[PDB]
Design a protein around this ligand. Structure first.
Ligand SMILES: CC(=O)Nc1cccc(-n2ccc(=O)c(-c3ccnn3-c3ccccc3F)n2)c1
Ligand SMILES: [Cl-]
Ligand SMILES: [Mg+2]
Ligand SMILES: [Zn+2]
Length: 313
């Protein structure tokens, strides 16, 4: 009960910032997550014994892939921590509980392949879940782990609170399907602009939580340039492996996934910043002003990629 987690001074201070990098010491990441739960939620939200057992089972069920791995899980959870801490009074106790867990679990058992590759391969999961294929699998994996003996971190919640938090977690994980982001952000853009955005409207909160999930999921593009640039390598290592597997199915991959077209990555990054990342953080900053540093950091990285093209690096 009186057992706090305490980080070294540099981490204690920098973990509060949006651009925090969780570092290369894997064995400190569970402790970093618990620290964030305790400050974001309370030392009472979860039983430490059950939480620690849940975290280590989640870790085991992430695969050794270049990008969609345990480090991504904890990175995405830290961005959500930074959003929640900078918007103290806007979120319920259940929401803060649900969303950190949703972020830790959002890519459970990822193989490093897109929904499109699963469908073209004719993977069994594509027959089970026709849309948001991997995201329905990630939620399924989350429910499976919660149901292991001694792993139900929500046990002290009432029956209705339990149904609510699992519904927050389901919608949050489904919302990390980037195919769904484009329409979600458009709707939020319309609602903010016409003044009809109402955070007491559950359908509206759901949409805002959706956008927070996209923002946390993409947060590699909101780090300092050296982190963003080095993470790009891991992201493209998966894209190129998927490209190889498309060629093995007798399909020419889109240039983004073709390792013969590495020359075109810098211009491909501009499109992604301009079509996806900047619009995401812009709409997020409009709804939640204290998340502005994500947009500023994203714009700085856009400027760095422009410099790569202009041959200045
Ligand atoms: C451009 C478009 O319209 N669609 C699209 C679709 C999927 C991927 C990317 N893509 C390209 C370049 C990147 O750096 C990233 C990117 C940056 C941080 N995270 N992701 C990311 C990685 C894997 C899966 C989804 C992700 F969002 N994503 C673009
Ligand atoms: Cl891979
Ligand atoms: Mg995902
Ligand atoms: Zn993800």
């Amino acid at each position: 009960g009186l057992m706090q987690f305490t980080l070294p001074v540099r981490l204690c201070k920098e973990i509060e910032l949006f651009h925090f990098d969780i570092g290369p010491f894997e064995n400190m990441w569970p402790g970093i997550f618990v620290y964030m739960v305790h400050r974001s939620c309370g030392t009472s939200c979860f039983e430490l014994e059950k939480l620690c057992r849940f975290i280590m089972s989640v870790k085991k069920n992430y695969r050794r892939v270049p990008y969609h791995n345990w480090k991504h899980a904890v990175t995405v959870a830290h961005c959500m921590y930074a959003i929640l801490q900078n918007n103290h009074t806007l979120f319920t106790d259940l929401e803060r509980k649900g969303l950190l867990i949703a972020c830790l679990c959002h890519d459970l058992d990822h193989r490093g392949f897109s929904n499109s590759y699963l469908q073209k391969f004719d993977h069994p999961l594509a027959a089970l879940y026709s849309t948001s294929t991997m995201e329905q699998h990630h939620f399924s994996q989350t429910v499976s782990i919660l149901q292991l003996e001694g792993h139900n971190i929500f046990s002290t919640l009432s029956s209705s609170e339990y149904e609510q938090v699992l519904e927050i977690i389901r919608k949050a994980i489904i919302a990390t399907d980037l195919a769904l982001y484009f329409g979600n952000r458009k709707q939020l853009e319309e609602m903010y602009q016409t003044g009809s955005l109402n955070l007491n409207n559950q359908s509206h909160r759901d949409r805002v939580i959706g956008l927070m999930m996209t923002a946390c999921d993409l947060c590699s593009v909101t780090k300092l340039w050296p982190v963003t640039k080095l993470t790009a390598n891991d992201i493209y290592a998966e894209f190129w492996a998927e490209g190889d597997e498309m060629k093995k199915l007798g399909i020419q991959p889109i240039p983004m996934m073709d390792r013969d077209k590495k020359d075109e990555v810098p211009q491909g990054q501009l499109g992604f910043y301009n079509a996806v990342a900047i619009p995401c953080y812009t709409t997020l900053t409009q709804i939640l002003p204290p998340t502005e540093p994500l947009l500023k950091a994203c714009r700085d990285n856009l400027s760095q990629w422009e410099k790569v093209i202009r041959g200045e690096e």
